[PDB]
Amino acid sequence: FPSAVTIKSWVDKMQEDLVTLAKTASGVHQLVDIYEKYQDLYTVEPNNARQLVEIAARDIEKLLSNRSKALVRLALEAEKVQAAHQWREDFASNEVVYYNAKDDLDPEKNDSEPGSQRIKPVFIDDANFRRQVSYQHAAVHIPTDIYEGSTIVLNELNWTSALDDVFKKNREEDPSLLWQVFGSATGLARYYPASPWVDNSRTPNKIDLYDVRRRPWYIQGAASPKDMLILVDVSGSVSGLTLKLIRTSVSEMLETLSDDDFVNVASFNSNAQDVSCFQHLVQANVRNKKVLKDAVNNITAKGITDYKKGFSFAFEQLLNYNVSRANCNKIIMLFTDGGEERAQEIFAKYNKDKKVRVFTFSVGQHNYDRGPIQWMACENKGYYYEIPSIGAIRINTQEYLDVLGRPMVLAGDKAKQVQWTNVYLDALELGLVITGTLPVFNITGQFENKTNLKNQLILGVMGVDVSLEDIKRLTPRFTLCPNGYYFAIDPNGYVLLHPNLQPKPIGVGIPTINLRKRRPNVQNPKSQEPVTLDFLDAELENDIKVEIRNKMIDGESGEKTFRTLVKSQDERYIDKGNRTYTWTPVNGTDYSLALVLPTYSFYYIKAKIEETITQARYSETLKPDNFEESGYTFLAPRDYCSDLKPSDNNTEFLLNFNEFIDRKTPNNPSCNTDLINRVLLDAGFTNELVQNYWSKQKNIKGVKARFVVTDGGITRVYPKEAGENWQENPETYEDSFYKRSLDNDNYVFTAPYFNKSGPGAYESGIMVSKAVEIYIQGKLLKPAVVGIKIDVNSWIENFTKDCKRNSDVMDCVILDDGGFLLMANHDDYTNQIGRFFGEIDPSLMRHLVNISVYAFNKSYDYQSVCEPGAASKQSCITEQTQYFFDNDSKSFSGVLDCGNCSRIFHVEKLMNTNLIFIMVESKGTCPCDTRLLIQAEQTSDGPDPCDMVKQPRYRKGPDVCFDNNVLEDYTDC
Amino acid sequence: MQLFGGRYDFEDTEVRRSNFDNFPQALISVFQVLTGEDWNSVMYNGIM
């Protein structure tokens, strides 16, 4: 075995060659000097990370206020207009004319049902709605199993027709406004602008189940939070039909809860216990509700009934106060069938003062007495529901939000405050949105105090959407490096704005589909959950980020600079970087806005070329006709002007950008001049580099390509023939290697992928990249990244020239921090280049982790596609591992043993790169393999919620809530 | 009422009106089985 000194001299020559090649061929000092040469075509402006946060906070507050002022207008007109409705019961003569959505646009049908008349709309095609809308009238949605032609429905379509003027006036005062909806308490939803519903119920074979009364914006604006305790009866007499109806009913009731409410499902049969692992009230988010649904499905019926024990258990669950609660509405939902006990002593002892409501549900079709259950419901300010079949479940499990809203109505004008919901996926295919809600009250015979009977329920809920692509325009991210970004947060932890929040449902557990039970044409539902991704699940979680999160959940403004791990764009690496979080509260609302800036990004370049001559010279340099002189050029699909559109085929886009910069005078009145000025100055600098320096040495020995990625969105691959093997994103703020090479202070090596479709390991090469760092007036600035593709074959030639090609006594490998094979010694390894080392030689990898040359960090990705297991793609949680260099030590000399074996090894880390070199006794000598150390997304289900509820994350709930008014009626039950 | 009383606890939604749940119903079921009309359906409910 060779010695440490000969090994060290080997690696010294290796690093010398690699680094000198990359440096002289990529041309870093050249680009540094031609940036610092001009220094007068641009200026260096600062990023006052407090001023930026405050400006964006005001812009967001202004937007949400503009949306609020459009809601009170709608609610005022709606109250005033229904206050003067006549309630006629004849319509066969005086028709209601209206555009029913989800009616077939085939003009040869002529339905025009009794009592009502249709509208054939014009339907221009629009942007801001990726569909065809008509600004002339409002569309109406009526649930499939609700006749449109009732007297109740035809009376809502008669007085809601007065909303269209307010809809139009709201839209003309602010043309950037998305859907406006009035969702009524009879099932209707009247929205503007008119647009056909995604699903006709039966015209295609996909029927739709959309009820406005269950949309979370409605349930959010229709009542305060809760402290619900479901109390299932699993005595013996419920077995059979009513038991399975009880299971389906409890699930459909849990689906009417939010992340502001707390819940628990208990269960009694001569003894009350918890249905699951929880044992108190838990927060009713998607994971906890998955636990409680899976626990309710495992329920069996046996024993004697005893209501006193069940109600003692319930009322003692609602008195914990050692745990976190909503503290507002304490209610008990008793899912039973019937019986002969009423338990008056329990209620007289536990809620003599009637702070808890009781809603009792009598499920199934049986003969047991129902007197006591109605009494329980009526004696305890609650309500009584009957569920005889599966069709009754949906409407009877959402109807308690009428009882819960009588105190809100009675509170009068203190109850009308605009609220904003979690982030959910729009129903009309618009992306992630938040909705603002405001309840509408029924004021009929109000001025004289005449009725006050139907005047304890709300009429409906008004709503107005705000997409997230609309919030992300008030936080423009193109003056910070690829590494800084804005992000906002609830007073709940959840994230309203983050680089890592995709438009897909949050997954829980592993999905398991049963093919053998799925009829081919039965239209299973899709999804209704919101996209509630916590903050500490969108980033890597330190101990400091927890304190920042807590510190800005309760609206403090502050700043903190620390050192953290940053997971790379593609989840394969992990860096260490200095960051600065500066946060502030959004004053009008409960949101909080933060800005993450890496030091070295406290200064940016602002272009200063206004001259027709310079700008024309530069704009010449990006035109396909002469790529030969400048090498393949890519342009970032930013929003330079509101006239050209990002096209996702970058040749089309570069052509358009050219014909626009000319075809529209450099006045550019509708164009962002800082963006395109930066792009032009940038292409100028890049092309100076390509012309003067690169094009001299046309062919370097081992080089395969040479690229420059920069800010301003310019990319240049030098030999045009190489530009066909360049697969990176053309928008430079999404290039993984760019963000990685800005973090490090050396040459970052990116390993290719493995067994990937496409020429990716041998025809392309291995990518080296170093970031340009210039000093203008003592100020650091990293404006570009230069790079190289090293050819594998020339590398092997330099690598092999005491371990030799396919030698069977020892292995000589090179890895990068991450453990991905780069340069082997075996022609059988070298065939799998870019593959995780612990997947090809796991014993040595596990030992390297043990002696701590490699550390690692594990995380969960909550938004991933899954191949459904056995018990086309579902949403599940995946676990992600990532390895990195922890011990900054340079050499590790040791011996790894598996038992009766022995393999002596030496590893040495190359200096000024991120590469490691391992020389180890061979593997075929010792027939000892343990198990593959896989680094890949593995579909998982953890963490275990039963333990997070014992130590939950800090959280701050609403402080305004309306329960227990005194003028309440409760003669309805 | 002894043998099949309260044992029709089937977890489907099919309605089996001829059961033995209380005395008037058991009397009706036995009468129907005497007249012979559909006694086999009652037998299948009993065997399941």
PDB file of C-alpha atoms in Angstrom, chain B residues 5-37:
ATOM      1  CA  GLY B   5     -83.399 -11.509  16.273  1.00  0.00           C
ATOM      2  CA  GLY B   6     -80.962  -8.666  15.850  1.00  0.00           C
ATOM      3  CA  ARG B   7     -78.606 -10.664  13.661  1.00  0.00           C
ATOM      4  CA  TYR B   8     -79.428  -8.965  10.358  1.00  0.00           C
ATOM      5  CA  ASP B   9     -76.649  -6.469  11.072  1.00  0.00           C
ATOM      6  CA  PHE B  10     -75.416  -6.507   7.490  1.00  0.00           C
ATOM      7  CA  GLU B  11     -73.111  -3.663   6.532  1.00  0.00           C
ATOM      8  CA  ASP B  12     -74.677  -3.078   3.124  1.00  0.00           C
ATOM      9  CA  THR B  13     -77.573  -0.820   2.158  1.00  0.00           C
ATOM     10  CA  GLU B  14     -79.984  -3.504   0.935  1.00  0.00           C
ATOM     11  CA  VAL B  15     -83.312  -3.359   2.727  1.00  0.00           C
ATOM     12  CA  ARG B  16     -84.478  -6.639   4.254  1.00  0.00           C
ATOM     13  CA  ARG B  17     -87.928  -5.823   5.529  1.00  0.00           C
ATOM     14  CA  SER B  18     -88.784  -9.409   6.496  1.00  0.00           C
ATOM     15  CA  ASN B  19     -86.614  -9.736   9.578  1.00  0.00           C
ATOM     16  CA  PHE B  20     -87.257 -10.918  13.123  1.00  0.00           C
ATOM     17  CA  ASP B  21     -86.477  -7.770  15.072  1.00  0.00           C
ATOM     18  CA  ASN B  22     -89.612  -7.470  17.207  1.00  0.00           C
ATOM     19  CA  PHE B  23     -92.790  -9.418  17.738  1.00  0.00           C
ATOM     20  CA  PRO B  24     -95.118  -8.001  15.055  1.00  0.00           C
ATOM     21  CA  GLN B  25     -92.367  -8.271  12.483  1.00  0.00           C
ATOM     22  CA  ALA B  26     -91.511 -11.825  13.481  1.00  0.00           C
ATOM     23  CA  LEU B  27     -95.189 -12.712  13.225  1.00  0.00           C
ATOM     24  CA  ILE B  28     -95.328 -11.201   9.733  1.00  0.00           C
ATOM     25  CA  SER B  29     -92.207 -13.080   8.639  1.00  0.00           C
ATOM     26  CA  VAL B  30     -93.429 -16.431   9.929  1.00  0.00           C
ATOM     27  CA  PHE B  31     -96.779 -15.912   8.271  1.00  0.00           C
ATOM     28  CA  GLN B  32     -95.115 -15.113   4.959  1.00  0.00           C
ATOM     29  CA  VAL B  33     -93.001 -18.253   5.249  1.00  0.00           C
ATOM     30  CA  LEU B  34     -96.173 -20.253   5.899  1.00  0.00           C
ATOM     31  CA  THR B  35     -97.855 -18.985   2.748  1.00  0.00           C
ATOM     32  CA  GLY B  36     -94.627 -19.947   1.041  1.00  0.00           C
ATOM     33  CA  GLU B  37     -94.091 -16.619  -0.676  1.00  0.00           C
TER      34      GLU B  37
END
